[PDB]
Amino acid sequence: GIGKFLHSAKKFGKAFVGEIMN
Amino acid sequence: GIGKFLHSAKKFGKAFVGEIMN
Amino acid sequence: GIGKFLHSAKKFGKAFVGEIMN
Amino acid sequence: GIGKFLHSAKKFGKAFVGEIMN
Amino acid sequence: GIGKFLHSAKKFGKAFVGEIMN
Amino acid sequence: GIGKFLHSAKKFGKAFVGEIMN
Numbered sequence: 001g002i003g004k005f006l007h008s009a010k011k012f013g014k015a016f017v018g019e020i021m022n
Numbered sequence: 023g024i025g026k027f028l029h030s031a032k033k034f035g036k037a038f039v040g041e042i043m044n
Numbered sequence: 045g046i047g048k049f050l051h052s053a054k055k056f057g058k059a060f061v062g063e064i065m066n
Numbered sequence: 067g068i069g070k071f072l073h074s075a076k077k078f079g080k081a082f083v084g085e086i087m088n
Numbered sequence: 089g090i091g092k093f094l095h096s097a098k099k100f101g102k103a104f105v106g107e108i109m110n
Numbered sequence: 111g112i113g114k115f116l117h118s119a120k121k122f123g124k125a126f127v128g129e130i131m132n
Contacts, residue, residue: 002050005037006085009053012034013086015027019116020123024116028107031119035108041050042057049081056078059071063094064101072090072129075097079130093125100122103115 001040005034005041005053006046006050008030008034008037009049009082010085012027012030013082015030016119016123017086018023019027019120020127027119028112028116031104031115032107035104038053038057039108041054042061045084049078049085052074052078052081056071056074059074060097060101062067063071063098064105068094071097072094075093075126076129079126083130089128093122093129096118096122096125100115100118103118106111107115
């Protein structure tokens with residue numbers, strides 16, 4: 001639900017920024 | 023790293039599809 | 045904040061699915 | 067269409083960066 | 089620019105759906 | 111597969127940051 005979406009979004013977003021900078 | 027990115031992407035993607043259908 | 049994020053995510057997600065199918 | 071996709075993407079992207087930094 | 093964004097989005101979106109279903 | 115996903119993600123992510131800053 002909303003919790004899983006918000007939590008998963010933040011984790012993914014941080015990992016994605018890391019990939020963009022690699 | 024790559025593992026965290028791939029894993030987090032799949033979790034987020036599934037949650038996002040769930041949100042779009044809600 | 046959280047409201048804008050959730051709302052914008054749903055709008056984007058729906059538009060993105062539309063683009064993928066075009 | 068393309069307009070909605072581009073507009074919604076920018077709004078979402080800005081909100082997502084905000085969430086990542088929160 | 090806009091072309092690269094639109095093109096890259098579609099490619100990514102299709103690949104992402106593929107990952108979600110794997 | 112995984113290669114296409116990772117490559118397409120990085121390209122999209124960079125283009126998306128560019129759009130957010132435009």
